[PDB]
């Protein structure tokens, strides 16, 4: 019965730009993605169901799918943030 989730403005737009962002933008993005996931996890706590009636199942099904897509994106964010990070210390 959640309604308290914080919402991620311009996220799906910013997410699709990971490969083209600069490091500072990635830092703000990473923090924002995590803020979103914190909200999703608070909810997974309230049902007491981990990531592993019929309107229950449907929401939980979606909640999970959302986190996974967010995790797959945040993962990409770090893989790219890492490469950009490595370029900084080879630059030097």
């Amino acid at each position: 019965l959640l309604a308290n989730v914080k919402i991620d403005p311009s996220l799906t737009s910013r997410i699709s730009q990971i490969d083209s962002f600069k490091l500072s933008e990635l830092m703000v993005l990473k923090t924002d993605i995590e803020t979103q996931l914190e909200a999703y996890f608070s909810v997974l706590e309230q049902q007491g169901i981990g990531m592993d009636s019929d309107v229950d199942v449907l929401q939980v099904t979606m909640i999970r799918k959302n986190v996974n897509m967010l995790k797959n994106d945040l993962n990409h964010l770090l893989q790219r943030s890492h490469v950009l990070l490595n370029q900084h210390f080879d630059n030097m």
């Binding site: 490091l23 890492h82 030097m92």
Partner: protein
């Protein structure tokens, strides 16, 4: 599915996992580099090797490093994202771009105990060993798999790929710190203790978190304190 012509990942990029990785090379690298020897003595190499273990422990890493050291094409499939036409098409491409290492991730999602499953059994009976296409599968639950997959001539070679032990963790942190200037007084062993029960993925994410803080501080390298804040930061996730 993801195809990589030739992945640029050496064994040098894999922290720990020495015993397992050698087991893998005995099962895939050897019959590839010298298939005749397996015919001379007359024994078939394993067509498929199953890598089971927790996530972010380097199952993909191992399969890419083999594909690298053996100069092969790396073709990866995600098991959940398959949930039969596509399996045939896969192996077809795999034969076409030989040498090829087929990496089936989340195999349990399609191989629990249907159409797509049966297809995979067919495709592996199809191509013969000593051939230059080898299959590697990755899963969490080898218990949950249908016993047809583990029968001989398929995934008949099993390798546990567990979390990094205290020391393996040190390597993994250093490994992701190589391309990154690092102070000489950095205590890699204390870091390994504070990252109890960490995985490879998380340990990489620590190095990403550390180098960020060093950058935010305009340091010319990453200090030991940065890492610990990194571990601190990573812990909350």
């Amino acid at each position: 599915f993801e195809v990589v012509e030739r992945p640029n990942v050496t064994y040098n990029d894999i922290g720990g996992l020495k015993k397992q990785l050698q087991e893998l090379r005995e099962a895939i690298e050897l019959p590839l580099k010298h298939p005749e020897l397996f015919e001379e003595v007359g024994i078939d190499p394993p067509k498929g090797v199953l890598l089971y273990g927790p996530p972010g422990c380097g199952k993909t890493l191992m399969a890419k490093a083999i594909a690298h050291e053996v100069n092969a094409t790396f073709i990866r499939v995600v098991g959940s994202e398959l949930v039969a036409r596509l399996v045939h098409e896969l192996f077809e491409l795999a034969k076409e771009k030989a040498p090829t290492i087929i990496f089936i991730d989340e195999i349990d999602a399609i191989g629990a105990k249907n159409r797509t499953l049966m297809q995979l059994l067919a495709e592996m009976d199809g191509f013969d060993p000593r051939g230059n296409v080898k299959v590697i599968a990755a899963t969490n639950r080898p218990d949950i798999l249908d016993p047809a997959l583990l029968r001989p001539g398929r995934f008949d070679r099993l390798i546990e790929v567990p979390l990094p032990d205290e020391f393996s963790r040190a390597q993994i942190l250093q490994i992701h710190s190589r391309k990154m200037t690092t102070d000489d007084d950095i205590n890699w062993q204390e870091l390994a203790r504070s990252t109890d029960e960490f995985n490879g993925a998380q340990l990489k994410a620590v190095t990403v978190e550390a180098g960020m803080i060093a950058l935010r501080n305009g340091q010319s390298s990453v200090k030991h304190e940065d890492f610990v804040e990194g571990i601190s930061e990573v812990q909350a996730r």
